[PDB]
Amino acid sequence: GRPRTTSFAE
Amino acid sequence: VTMNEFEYLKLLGKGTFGKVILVKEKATGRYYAMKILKKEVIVAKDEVAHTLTENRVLQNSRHPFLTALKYSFQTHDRLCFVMEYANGGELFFHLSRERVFSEDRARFYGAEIVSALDYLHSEKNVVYRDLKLENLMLDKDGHIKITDFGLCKEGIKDGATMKTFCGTPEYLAPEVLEDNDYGRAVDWWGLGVVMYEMMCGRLPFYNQDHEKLFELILMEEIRFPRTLGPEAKSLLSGLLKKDPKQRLGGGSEDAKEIMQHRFFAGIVWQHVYEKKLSPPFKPQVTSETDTRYFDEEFTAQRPHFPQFDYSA
Numbered sequence: 001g002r003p004r005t006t007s008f009a010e
Numbered sequence: 011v012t013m014n015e016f017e018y019l020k021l022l023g024k025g026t027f028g029k030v031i032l033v034k035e036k037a038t039g040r041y042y043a044m045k046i047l048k049k050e051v052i053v054a055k056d057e058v059a060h061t062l063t064e065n066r067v068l069q070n071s072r073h074p075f076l077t078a079l080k081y082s083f084q085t086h087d088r089l090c091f092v093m094e095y096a097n098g099g100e101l102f103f104h105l106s107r108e109r110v111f112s113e114d115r116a117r118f119y120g121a122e123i124v125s126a127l128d129y130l131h132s133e134k135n136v137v138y139r140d141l142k143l144e145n146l147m148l149d150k151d152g153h154i155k156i157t158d159f160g161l162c163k164e165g166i167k168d169g170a171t172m173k174t175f176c177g178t179p180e181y182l183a184p185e186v187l188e189d190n191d192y193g194r195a196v197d198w199w200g201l202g203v204v205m206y207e208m209m210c211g212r213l214p215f216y217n218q219d220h221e222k223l224f225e226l227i228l229m230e231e232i233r234f235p236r237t238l239g240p241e242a243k244s245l246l247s248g249l250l251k252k253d254p255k256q257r258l259g260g261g262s263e264d265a266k267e268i269m270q271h272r273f274f275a276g277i278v279w280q281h282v283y284e285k286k287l288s289p290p291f292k293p294q295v296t297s298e299t300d301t302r303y304f305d306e307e308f309t310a311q312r313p314h315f316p317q318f319d320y321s322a
């Protein structure tokens with residue numbers, strides 16, 4: 001199980 | 011409808027811009043998920059246009075595997091979306107525990123996801139852009155719900171292109187990392203990464219460090235564990251082509267090219283839509299306030315926005 005990811009926008 | 015129309019029960023998620031809470035509407039006894047954002051924070055973090063986008067996409071869309079919006083409303087300090095509650099939790103929750111899904115079970119979720127994305131692209135002219143385990147939940151019966159529409163691109167008709175660097179680093183398509191204009195086929199890259207995680211138990215490109223991860227995405231071919239069947243391999247190969255012109259789904263036929271693929275030969279797409287296919291997993295909840303499929307860290311725990319407000 002991988003860590004939770006984070007969405008983003010530049 | 012205001013904060014007083016509801017009782018607040020459990021925290022389901024909390025992520026910088028705000029929180030998600032299981033609520034009950036006083037007037038109806040119905041349970042919903044409430045996304046509550048602080049106006050101050052949304053404004054300060056530049057999240058305004060993403061909030062309006064999610065509000066339009068949710069209002070404009072009606073699909074069995076897309077989260078339905080009941081109300082949007084604001085206060086002096088808050089914006090609130092009251093949405094259908096997915097009691098089965100995130101796919102990320104399930105796959106963290108089970109490690110991998112059987113090919114049949116990954117197929118069932120893949121088909122529902124394809125049905126929703128074909129709808130977004132073909133009926134709504136929307137590219138979703140942030141497909142991932144965290145934004146894929148299960149409702150009470152076991153069907154997919156897509157959540158979180160803030161990164162969508164609207165007004166995207168057929169092959170038209172876009173430029174925004176956004177998404178989730180672990181899922182970014184190579185044409186996006188190339189700083190190229192890109193079309194709706196990025197959604198099929200995301201599907202490929204999600205299908206890959208489901209059937210293989212890991213991301214197809216992985217480094218903790220986003221920039222090293224970007225180098226793998228652009229350079230390396232995916233590995234295929236020896237347990238993958240030949241139709242699964244062909245599907246993953248096709249959806250994870252790095253040139254979107256060569257990707258499965260990357261032509262004018264869009265989702266119809268994936269629907270025809272031999273990995274989905276068993277599937278009757280009209281019955282996927284009509285929800286006539288038996289989910290492989292039914293959430294075993296006792297109650298409605300039973301949040302067994304949500305993480306314990308959570309459940310244990312200024313302008314006017316013109317024409318934000320909405321009721322279904």
Ligand SMILES: CCc1c[nH]c2ncnc(N3CC[C@](N)(CNC(=O)c4ccc(F)cc4F)C3)c12
Nearest residue numbers: 022023024025027028029030043094095096157
């Ligand atoms: C808000 C999406 C949603 C609709 N229906 C739901 N039913 C149950 N849970 C939901 N959750 C729980 C956590 C979630 N799976 C992922 N989103 C977030 O965690 C999140 C996103 C933005 C934000 F500001 C705060 C958050 F917690 C949504 C839903």
Ligand SMILES: [Mn+2]
Nearest residue numbers: 005006179180
């Ligand atoms: Mn990360």
